């Protein structure tokens, strides 16, 4: 029998499947592309999680539905994969002061995701500890190697122009790592764009693109479209892995800035 792991969403699924390798099967509760914050689980989502040996979740109140969901599950252990991360506060807007849950968009934070998943797997499936530890070591080397080329590419964007328009803080951890300022959009966004001649504006995927488009139209900044960071694609889609999500997000940002 294969140890069965269930995760709340696809980013954790991919990180955990690299650590589990061949000795455990990792499934996500939510399909690729699903809205993760207020997902509404079905009765069969609960039954699927009930068949697992371990449930992994992000915490930091990413999954507002998880506490109720988990209360419906009997005697399946869970582990929060962000234990030990320094949470960034949402700096402005209606959620000012609250922990920003999007911690996976910092590649350094992904090393802590890996460590917590490895620990939980080794705790609950000790027979396979050697495999989990080896796989976590090998995958962590891949993740450490992510940061250098991304940092170098984004560092060519002059610091004066290094701004991201944010609505729910989906990019705040990437912005912290690579030195981007953030201006919140619930217009005073227009002024900051014009003042610093920020060349491009992106939209978050959990909100309407209309206000970001209005900002672009009025300032003359290019509208670079939507940046999706809450989900992977399917296996055969263009964003099948956590590594591909990080690399593609930075490439889209950098290209928006002519870099």
Residue numbers in the entry: 40 to 225, 239 to 311
Question: What does the paper behind this entry write?
Answer:
Bacterial substrate-binding proteins (SBPs) belong to the widespread ABC superfamily and specifically have a role in sequestering various metabolites, including amino acids, nucleic acids, carbohydrates and metals. All SBPs follow an evolution­arily conserved c-clamp architecture containing α/β globular lobe domains connected by a backbone and interdomain β-strand hinges. Recently, we determined the crystal structure of holo YfeA, a Yersinia pestis polyspecific cluster A-I SBP, and reported a method for purifying apo YfeA in the presence of the Yfe transporter by fractionation, adding an additional strategy for the production of apo SBP proteins. In this report, we solved the crystal structure of apo YfeA as well as that of holo YfeA that was reconstituted by soaking crystals of apo YfeA with zinc.
A possible explanation for the improvement might be that gentle pipetting better preserved the sphero­plasts, reducing inadvertent rupture of the inner membrane and contamination of the periplasm with cytoplasmic contents, including metals that can reintegrate with a potentially apo YfeA. These changes enabled the purification and crystallization of seemingly apo YfeA protein exhibiting relatively low EDS signals [Fig. 1(a)]. Diffraction-quality apo native YfeA crystals were observed to crystallize in the orthorhombic space group P212121 and had unit-cell parameters a = 40, b = 52, c = 113 Å, which are 2 Å smaller in the a dimension than the unit-cell parameters of the His-tagged holo YfeA crystal form 1. Apo YfeA contains 111 disordered protein atoms in a mobile helix and a 94.0 Å2 metal-binding site. The missing amino-acid residues constitute the base of the flexible helix 7 and the subsequent loop that have been proposed to undergo structural rearrangement during metal transfer. Close inspection of the changes in site 1 between the apo and the reconstituted holo forms identifies the key change that triggers the spontaneous refolding of the mobile helix in the flexible lobe and closure of the c-clamp. In the apo structure, the site 1 residue Glu207 is completely disengaged and a placeholder water molecule is observed to coordinate the nearby residue Glu256 and to establish tetrahedral coordination of a site 1 water molecule [Fig. 3(a)]. In this conformation, the site 1 residues His76, His141 and Asp282 remain grouped together as an electrostatic touch fastener primed to mate with a metal atom. In the apo state, YfeA has three grouped (His76/His141/Asp282) site 1 metal-binding residues linked to a rigid amino-terminal domain lobe that serve as an electrostatic attractant for metal ions. A fourth, disengaged site 1 residue (Glu207) is linked to a flexible carboxy-terminal domain lobe containing 111 disordered protein atoms from a mobile helix.
